[PDB]
Write a protein that binds this DNA or RNA. Structure first.
Lengths: 149, 118, 127, 76, 178
RNA sequence: GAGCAAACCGGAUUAGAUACCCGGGUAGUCCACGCCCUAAACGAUGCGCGCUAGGUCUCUGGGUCUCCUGGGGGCCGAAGCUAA
RNA sequence: UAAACUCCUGAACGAAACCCCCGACGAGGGGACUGACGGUAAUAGCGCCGGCCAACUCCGUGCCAGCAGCCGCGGUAAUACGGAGGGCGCGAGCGUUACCCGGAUUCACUGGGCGUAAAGGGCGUGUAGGCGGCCUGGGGCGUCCCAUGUGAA
């Protein structure tokens, strides 16, 4: 019961002696929807090999986001247990829980993580430096790890 | 002040009154050249608007015949376009003259087959 | 600067290196109070009173996991000396992780504060 | 209402100047700001209150211009 | 509105019963299949159709959306009102849902024309918000499309008795109901 | 007021030479008292405190002095940071 | 039945005035009147198709006439100007002009920076001010909670 969604695949070109050569990178999220999720980024000459590579990689390195999961103890139905603010570098990310029907209100970088995260409803805010890469993403990830409950 | 105050945003067209249109009188039917690489004789006109009481330069659309704008013809300024300015072509022109409306002295170009007549 | 900030920083810094132990800092009643939550929440293995040069200090057991970045990936100070941060029970804030607040009630986690229905300066957030 | 303050000045006739001090939460900032005001209070006996006394002032009808308060009594 | 409806249903490519009618896009590639759009395309395209369906003005539409947006739960269905909240709640819509009218517009005219009743009081306001436990009867003088209606089933949220030519809005219908 | 040397006076080079090269040379460069207050006034990096591998050379103090410990000056580099 | 094709269910409600009773002046039940018109398929879409951004061909034009939010496009092969065909999106309005708020954290708190991109003050001494180690006790000003009043329409 591993759902497998793919965040996105990029062309990633590079230049070498008198020649460009690209490979593909695929980010894949894998989750039970019961509390287990894994993220895997695998690259290959072809898109398919990459996605499959990522899926396998994601399967390894799974993390226990505390959202809802298969009927047992409940997480929060598509939402987060509590608000956390995390600053990474100049980047600060804020997550606040929301009721169902709210939707995932966030900027893209934060959103893309939260959706594969399995979170359906949240209110977010990016403050400070907004380098998506530099630390908004890292900041989000840390924020998720921090959540308890 | 406690802190320095930075310049805020400015409205693109001060037709005054934040009005949709303003009417003015032509001072001069000049012709300005473009910027960047494009070149040609863009037809423009200085106008004395009633509202702002401001004097502005406005583009006169259409091939026109010669054009139907003279020394003191009444005209309406649309600010046609978001700004109404022709940035790429000519700096300094904030508004377009509406002759499509054919309001006032500005006559429409006659028999223009193309849709831009609208 | 701030004693509390110093402690969070020391732990943050030490964890990055992966030190098992860390003199989190010289002990203070408040600091120990904070560490107790850190323990209960499971962020740190525990802490202990230690004597360094006849001065009391708190050793903090770091607790890491195999997978990746520390168990305590985040830990950021919020209220700071220049600007204090107080929040009503209404805006305790929520996240997957916890926030430690100090209330007249005592230092509690966000969940605990909600129960108590109290507010207070928001010392920090961890998750 | 009823206010408390100190008699800063005895100089005037039948009147006393009481300096009431107040603290409060400011609606906008919510910062706790403190300001004090001086109010002229009616003192009929002119022996009733001397400088240094702490008195309670009470809202009254206008006695004089710029005077809407009467000395309720001596706190001390 | 009252503009060429048909073209709008096509092109939005979503079935729109501007009349009760057919889906195929009018031009250039009526035949070709077009599928899942991007989020961006979805947002703009969604607006025009959700609105176009109801045949309502942006002004009215906006208020409804804003309310449904604030309330928690998926905005879309809460906004939608299968009978749930707002959109299908309009009296003009209900009459259509009830089968009184073949189309939403037709229902709108019926309601305006006064061939409609609510609680026996005749209401010719299409914007009228129907609450639960209200009966939407057909004006006495009028009576027609009810036949043919006989076989048709009705949403669980609503119900109608063909004989009286009456019906009731039982409750706010969920999107699933939609 | 020895030497040096803006300006200046000459010699040469050059198409021209108001320059570079060569010979002279005043202010100035030195001292005192007062004034000016600037700079690539640079580490182009404000001050204090705490915390986060080491290696190597060096100046200065202590030590149980083939190395440890304190203060300072350099180089290389963990983690990390940085658009590089 | 979709099509082709043939013809056009029925726009052209308007009415509430001159409520009582039971039931909560509600829902519901019982005890207000009144239409000449009265049956015809019967006004229309708007924006866009160079990139951002979904949608491309021919023709005309020739740095002109024009487009333009930004980058820009037109000087004889223009997917960027005008029309046409085709396409994408969704006109009883649609579009322009003017003005206000937004986007503008651009008078960055949320939410930015200062080695080399703009940005460390030439350096110190120190005033006001901002900030302040560990333990205990009093006060309860900030801070948090409850009740209450106010927060008109």
């Amino acid at each position: 019961g591993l759902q497998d969604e793919v965040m996105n695949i990029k062309p990633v070109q590079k230049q070498t002696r008198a020649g460009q050569r690209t490979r593909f990178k695929a980010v894949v999220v894998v989750g039970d929807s019961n509390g287990h999720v894994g993220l895997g980024i695998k690259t290959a000459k072809e898109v398919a090999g990459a996605i499959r590579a990522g899926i396998i990689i994601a399967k390894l390195s799974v993390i226990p986001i505390r959202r809802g999961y298969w009927g047992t103890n409940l997480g929060q139905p598509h939402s987060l247990a509590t608000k956390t603010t995390g600053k990474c570098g100049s980047v600060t990310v804020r997550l606040i829980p929301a009721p169902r029907g709210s939707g995932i209100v966030a900027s893209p970088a934060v959103k893309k993580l939260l959706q594969l995260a399995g979170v359906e409803d949240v209110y977010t805010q990016s403050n400070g430096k907004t380098r998506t890469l530099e630390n908004t993403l890292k900041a989000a990830f840390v924020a998720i790890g921090n959540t308890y409950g | 002040n406690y802190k320095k105050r930075l310049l805020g945003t400015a409205f693109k067209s001060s037709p005054f009154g934040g009005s949709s249109h303003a009417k003015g009188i032509v001072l001069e039917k000049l012709g300005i050249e473009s910027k960047q690489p494009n070149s040609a004789i863009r037809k423009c006109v200085r106008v004395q608007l009633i509202k702002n009481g401001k004097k502005v330069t406005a583009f006169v659309p259409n091939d026109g015949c010669l054009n139907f704008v003279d020394e003191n013809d009444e005209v309406l300024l649309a600010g046609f376009g978001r700004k109404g300015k022709a940035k790429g072509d000519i700096p300094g022109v904030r508004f377009k003259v509406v002759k499509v409306s054919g309001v006032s002295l500005l006559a429409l170009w006659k028999e223009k087959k193309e849709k831009p007549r609208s | 600067s701030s004693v509390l900030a110093d402690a969070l920083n020391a732990i943050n810094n030490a964890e990055k290196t992966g030190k098992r132990q860390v003199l989190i800092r010289p002990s203070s009643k408040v600091i120990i109070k904070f560490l107790q939550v850190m323990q209960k929440h499971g962020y740190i293995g525990e802490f202990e009173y230690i004597d360094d040069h006849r001065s009391g200090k708190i050793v903090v057991q770091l607790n890491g996991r195999l997978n990746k970045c520390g168990v305590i990936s985040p830990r950021f100070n919020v209220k700071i000396g220049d600007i204090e941060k107080w929040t009503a029970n209404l805006l305790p804030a929520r996240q997957f992780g916890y926030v430690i607040l100090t209330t007249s009630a005592g230092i509690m986690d966000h969940e605990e504060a909600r129960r108590k229905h109290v507010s207070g300066k928001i010392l920090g957030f961890v998750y | 209402k009823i206010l408390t303050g100190t008699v800063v000045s005895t100089k005037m006739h039948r009147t006393i100047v009481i300096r009431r001090a107040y603290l409060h939460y400011i609606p906008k900032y919510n910062r706790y700001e403190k300001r004090h005001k001086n109010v002229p209070v009616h003192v009929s006996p002119a022996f009733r209150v001397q400088v240094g006394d702490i008195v309670t002032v009470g809202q009254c009808r206008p006695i004089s211009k710029t005077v809407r308060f009467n000395v309720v009594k001596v706190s001390a | 509105y009252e503009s060429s409806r048909l073209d709008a249903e096509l092109k939005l490519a979503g079935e729109f019963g501007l009349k009760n009618k057919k889906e195929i896009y009018r031009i250039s590639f009526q035949l070709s299949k077009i599928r899942r759009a991007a989020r961006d395309l979805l947002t703009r395209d969604e607006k025009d159709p959700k609105r176009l369906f109801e045949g309502n003005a942006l002004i009215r539409r906006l208020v409804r959306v804003g309310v449904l947006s604030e309330d928690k739960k998926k905005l879309d269905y809460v906004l939608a009102l299968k009978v749930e909240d707002f959109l299908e709640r309009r009296l003009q819509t209900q009459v259509y849902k009830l089968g009184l009218a073949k189309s939403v517009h037709h229902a709108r005219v019926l309601i305006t024309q006064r061939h409609i009743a609510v609680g026996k009081q005749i209401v010719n306001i299409p914007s009228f918000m129907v609450r639960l436990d209200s009966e939407k009867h057909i004006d006495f003088a009028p009576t027609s499309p009810f036949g043919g209606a006989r076989p048709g089933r009705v949403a669980r949220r609503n119900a109608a008795r063909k004989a009286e030519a009456s019906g009731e809005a039982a409750d706010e219908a969920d999107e699933a109901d939609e």
